Design a protein around this ligand. Sequence first.
Ligand SMILES: NC(=O)c1ccc[n+]([C@@H]2O[C@H](COP(=O)([O-])OP(=O)(O)OC[C@H]3O[C@@H](n4cnc5c(N)ncnc54)[C@H](OP(=O)(O)O)[C@@H]3O)[C@@H](O)[C@H]2O)c1
Length: 321
Amino acid sequence: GAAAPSESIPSVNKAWVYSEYGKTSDVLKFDPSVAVPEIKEDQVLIKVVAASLNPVDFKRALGYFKDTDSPLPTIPGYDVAGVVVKVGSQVTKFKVGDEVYGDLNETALVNPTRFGSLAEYTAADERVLAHKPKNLSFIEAASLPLAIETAHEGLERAELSAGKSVLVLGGAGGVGTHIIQLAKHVFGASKVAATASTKKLDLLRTLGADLAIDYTKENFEDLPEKFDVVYDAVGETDKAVKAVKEGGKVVTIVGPATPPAILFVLTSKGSVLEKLKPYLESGKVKPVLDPTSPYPFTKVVEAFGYLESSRATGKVVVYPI
Ligand SMILES: NC(=O)c1ccc[n+]([C@@H]2O[C@H](COP(=O)([O-])OP(=O)(O)OC[C@H]3O[C@@H](n4cnc5c(N)ncnc54)[C@H](OP(=O)(O)O)[C@@H]3O)[C@@H](O)[C@H]2O)c1
């Protein structure tokens, strides 16, 4: 992995951009000539192959965390998979040519980059990246980081460990599909229960849920069964706290959290992906793509519209970029 020739890396590229906060249908525009970010010394430049969308992209674009956001205009997109083309002088873990993936923003809600993954090139901290598993496509790899790390961190915060039971509220989304798989296949849960609507229950069982609960037909919190861990991915901590065992833990990713539930926001770390690599290589944990994926780079507004419907099954990915 010798340095690319310098003339070979462009200083402008195509990207999606918004210059004011609002709905993606209103503010998100294609710009054919946006600056390529200059890398810091602990960053790499990536030729983007694929990018995933996350709810945070549209919540950010609505201005929900303007006080700690980076300055507009913004090129959105947290999740990336692609090929390193340049490395900073302090980088030791990657070289030119490495295939990598990660969630660009260490702290999602505090100073996320101005130069996201919905662009031909992006700059990424070494610390957020991992080597792409050889058996995963770039679409599949891009689908993973933010969701799989959020799943992992929430389960660790809830102290899940072998033999325990877990209930997942929102099993069929980007995050929930990983909460199920990790709980069963990485944390050794004895029983995994999860909620979704009627047509999504077989998917939950396929991913590792022992009990798939149709929230449109029954109320999980009224079941006599109580769980060691409850992981809310839908914003119903009021009910989640009613489904936990005394001494158990409830975590949510959608606040506000009703004590004793806690809310957290993930910390993006390549080391988490690296820890998960064997499960990804063996297929014990699988990417989960929405049937509408991939969306071409021309169709980013449509991809966001679909995510914003709250009905995505696994991940919405944009490819080819
Ligand atoms: N705090 C953090 O660090 C963090 C990190 C990631 C995500 N988040 C937040 O967590 C939430 C989930 O993100 P995500 O990427 O997984 O979203 P997503 O992929 O858009 O979630 C879509 C899924 O939600 C399901 N769903 C909707 N309402 C439901 C309900 N009442 N019960 C059960 N399932 C329900 C839908 O299944 P049905 O069609 O069957 O309803 C759909 O499959 C978002 O609000 C996001 O902002 C927070």
